């Protein structure tokens, strides 16, 4: 029922090979490997077979996607000689018995293959304080956060009020937009909103902080530029009541 | 194997009926439905076979011809915005996924009040952001403009839409001038 | 009791070298079997060749038994099988006429475990031409029986059936003569 | 004789009166001992021995497997029976009856499907009840059956009825 995929996220260079793991808590008959591109349908790669060779769908070859299943509960999918096309979310599904209708999917493995690792840039977070006009008419204050100048789409945005994560009155765009469209290497940008009571913002001891979690280069990547290395980091901006 | 609508629209609190076309369905074939939220994987919701079934998240209606099927979601909420897939097959190997039906759930705002405000950065007073908020769900949206998101404040049962536009130098009056902003719109 | 009985899935997996068998039976006869090596479905009744059965189902289903068997080995403290004694009988398909052709039928019954060697012999020399065997056919007592065939035109100077099974102290030979 | 561990799964179907009475029984077997089964007349996995108790509880816990196994009576047994009505249940082989002496008279019925038969021996149009010995129903394995009805002894007739035959065959032997 519960599936754990090891490579929740990863950024690899061209020509490298990455192995994805799919571990299941219970013993299951069927175990599949799926693939979903940024804006596409969920394409089935192959069916993992225990002690046999995987049953690949048309177009997918064992040479690029070698699959192994040592036990009924564990499988390994490898993407060899990676190209930018492979950048996708790799899912593994599971069926308890071949005559079940319920397929259990894992949380997924986000993959982004890059031709140049030098385009990776961390986000620049900035929080904008509410307008007095909004407070004057609506009696509510809306914080707006803005994370710009990051290349990979891997970002998580959370609002923290007085050191505690808040979910009520929070809004975040589902898909980050590109800053310079019609450019393959375009940087992305993401905005979020937090709305609170007027009396709660006008109090100066309350602390509002926009926290952006960014996933970037791993330890296996080399960096030889005068610029700082885009390591996985948490960039954040904050503001106090007035 | 299955043909279903490409996309649908609905407001919160409305019964949504997604109808799946499965002609050329085998007698032993089984009907299955999945719900995939963005960035996540598909989640199994309901299962039926020549028999209308009703569960907790939803109910599945199966006509005798079995040439079609319909998934019914009652009192759809904002959290039901997802892609719904219709799968028909005999065994697990027969489960192939399609384009699905992209369902969007708009909020019902009883008191609309469109307006556009200007927000200034806490770090530096140089940059600013335009906020077009508190508009009804039927309006749609070197200059950057974000899609409309809906935020919920459960402490007061208040929901509102909003959009963000920044510039890099620009006035918030003509920020959303490409959108059909209503005439009833406040500015400062 | 029923008018007709069918086993839409006779699944067999043993530990004597992962030996697997997937068959379908109707009224005690073999409809088809899936060759787990070549991944092909072989139909034994010609009229049944019109249908199609995916050999991949047999492979995945046998893998479930492989997991199950290893689970029952740990649970039962490695309780092995009991080698029953086979019952062998040899007979012909049609009445023996020294000119016309006939098939000799060597039926081996009470086969448990399902591991056996059935070899036809003729005047002390092993015969390999014109022989064919059936799959392990299930029984109510969860044992098996196997049938081997040998086509021949009978004659006065013209067989034995050698059966090797663990429930036998020595290889058993059943003689047939016109 | 090395140690051998056998596991069996029999997905069996039972049919009576055609499609009127259909019973589904799936048997999971360790060596020769059925440990857990599913009968369509009980509707739930029940252990036969303690070895099948963990499996029966785990399978009954998964309501998805339960729902699809209750429907297997129609999707497997009743579905595949419609395929048998057009193939195996239409197979009809007429038997071959030959009489040859072996004091003893042997009537050989060799190639017939289905298995339903009734062989009688007659001595001058009077049926011989005693003194007749018949072999059991011999399954050839190639979807044919045979039987040998023997008799120790003017005209002797072998009376053989079969569903594939409109009228019984009466091969006769004399002298």
């Amino acid at each position: 029922a519960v599936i754990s995929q090891k490579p929740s996220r990863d950024i690899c260079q061209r020509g490298t090979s990455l192995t994805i793991q799919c571990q299941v808590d219970s013993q299951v008959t069927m175990m599949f490997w799926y693939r979903q591109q940024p804006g596409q349908s969920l394409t089935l790669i192959a069916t993992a077979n225990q002690g046999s060779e995987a049953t690949y769908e048309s177009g997918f070859v064992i040479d690029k996607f070698p699959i192994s299943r040592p036990n009924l509960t564990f499988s390994t999918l490898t993407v060899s000689n990676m190209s930018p096309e492979d950048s996708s979310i790799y899912l593994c599904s599971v069926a308890l018995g071949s005559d079940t209708g319920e397929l259990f999917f894992g949380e997924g493995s986000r993959l982004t293959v890059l031709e140049d690792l030098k385009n990776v840039f961390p986000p620049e977070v900035a929080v904008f304080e509410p307008s007095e006009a909004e407070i004057s008419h609506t009696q509510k204050a809306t914080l707006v956060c803005l994370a710009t100048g990051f290349f990979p789409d891997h970002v998580e945005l959370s609002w923290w009020v007085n050191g505690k994560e808040v979910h009520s009155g929070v809004c975040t765009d589902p898909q980050p937009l590109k800053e310079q469209p019609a450019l393959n290497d375009s940087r992305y940008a993401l905005s979020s909103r937090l709305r609170v009571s007027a009396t709660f913002w006008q109090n100066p001891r309350n602390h509002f902080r926009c926290q952006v979690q960014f996933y970037g280069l791993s330890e296996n990547d080399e960096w030889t530029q005068d610029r700082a290395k885009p390591v996985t980091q948490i960039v954040s901006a904050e503001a106090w009541g007035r | 194997k299955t043909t279903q609508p490409i996309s649908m629209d609905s407001y919160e609190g409305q019964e949504v009926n997604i109808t799946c076309s499965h002609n050329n369905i085998a007698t032993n074939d089984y009907i299955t439905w999945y719900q995939q939220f963005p960035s996540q994987g598909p989640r199994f919701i309901i299962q039926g076979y020549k028999t209308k079934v009703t569960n907790e998240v939803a109910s599945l209606f199966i006509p005798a011809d079995r040439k079609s099927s319909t998934l019914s979601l009652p009192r759809v909420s904002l959290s039901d915005t997802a892609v719904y897939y219709c799968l028909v097959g005999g065994l697990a190997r027969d489960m192939r996924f399609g384009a699905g039906t992209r369902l969007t759930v708009k909020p019902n705002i009883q008191n609309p009040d469109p307006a556009v405000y200007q927000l200034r950065d806490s770090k530096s007073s140089d940059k600013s952001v335009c906020l077009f908020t508190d508009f009804d769900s039927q309006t749609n949206v070197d200059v950057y403009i974000t899609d409309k998101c809906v935020l919920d404040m459960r402490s007061m049962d208040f929901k509102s839409n909003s959009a963000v536009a920044w510039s890099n130098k620009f006035a918030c009056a003509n920020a959303f001038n490409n959108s059909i902003i209503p005439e009833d719109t406040f500015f400062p | 009791v029923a008018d007709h009985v069918a086993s839409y899935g006779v699944n067999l997996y043993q530990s004597y070298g992962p030996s697997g068998q997937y068959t379908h039976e109707f009224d005690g006869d073999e409809q088809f079997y899936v060759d787990l090596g070549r991944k092909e479905t072989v139909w034994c009744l010609p009229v049944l060749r019109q249908f199609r059965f995916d050999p991949q189902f047999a492979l995945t289903n046998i893998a479930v038994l492989k997991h199950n068997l290893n689970s029952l080995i740990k649970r039962s403290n490695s309780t092995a099988a009991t080698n029953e004694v086979p019952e062998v009988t040899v007979f012909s398909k049609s009445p023996v006429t020294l000119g016309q052709p006939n098939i000799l039928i060597c039926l081996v019954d009470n086969i448990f475990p399902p591991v056996v060697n059935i070899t036809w012999l003729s005047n002390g020399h092993s015969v390999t031409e014109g022989v064919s065997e059936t799959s392990f056919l299930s029984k109510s007592d969860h044992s098996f029986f196997k049938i081997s065939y040998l086509t021949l035109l009978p004659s006065a100077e013209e067989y034995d059936c050698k059966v090797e099974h663990w429930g036998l102290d020595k290889p058993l030979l059943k003689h047939w003569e016109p | 004789s090395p140690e051998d561990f056998v596991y069996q799964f029999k997905g069996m179907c039972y049919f009576t009166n055609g499609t009127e009475r259909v019973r589904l029984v799936s048997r999971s077997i360790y060596n020769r001992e059925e440990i857990v089964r599913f009968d369509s007349d009980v509707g739930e996995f029940r252990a036969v021995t303690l070895l099948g108790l963990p499996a029966a509880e785990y399978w009954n816990s998964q309501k998805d497997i339960l729902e699809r196994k209750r429907a297997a009576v129609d999707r497997v047994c009743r579905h595949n029976y419609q395929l048998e009505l057009r193939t195996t249940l239409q197979r009809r082989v007429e038997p071959t009856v030959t009489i040859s002496p072996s004091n003893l008279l042997v009537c050989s019925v060799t190639d017939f499907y289905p298995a339903q038969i009734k062989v009688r021996w007659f001595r001058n149009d009077q049926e011989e009840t005693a003194g007749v010995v018949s072999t059991p129903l011999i399954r050839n394995g190639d979807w044919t059956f045979q039987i040998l009805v023997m008799l120790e002894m003017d005209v002797y007739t072998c009376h053989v009825e079969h569903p594939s035959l409109q009228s019984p065959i009466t091969v006769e032997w004399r002298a």
Binding site: S26, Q27, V28, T29, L72, L96, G97, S98, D99 | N28, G90, L91 | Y8, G9, N11, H24, F51, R52, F53, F57, N61, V64, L65, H67, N68, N70, S71, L72, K74, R75 | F9, G11, S26, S28, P54, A55, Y58, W59, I65, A72, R75, V76, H79, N80, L83
Partner: peptide, 13 residues
């Protein structure tokens, strides 16, 4: 076209 009966996996081994 013939519909088969599968075997369910045992738990935990």
């Amino acid at each position: 076209q013939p519909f088969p009966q599968p075997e369910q996996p045992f738990p935990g081994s």
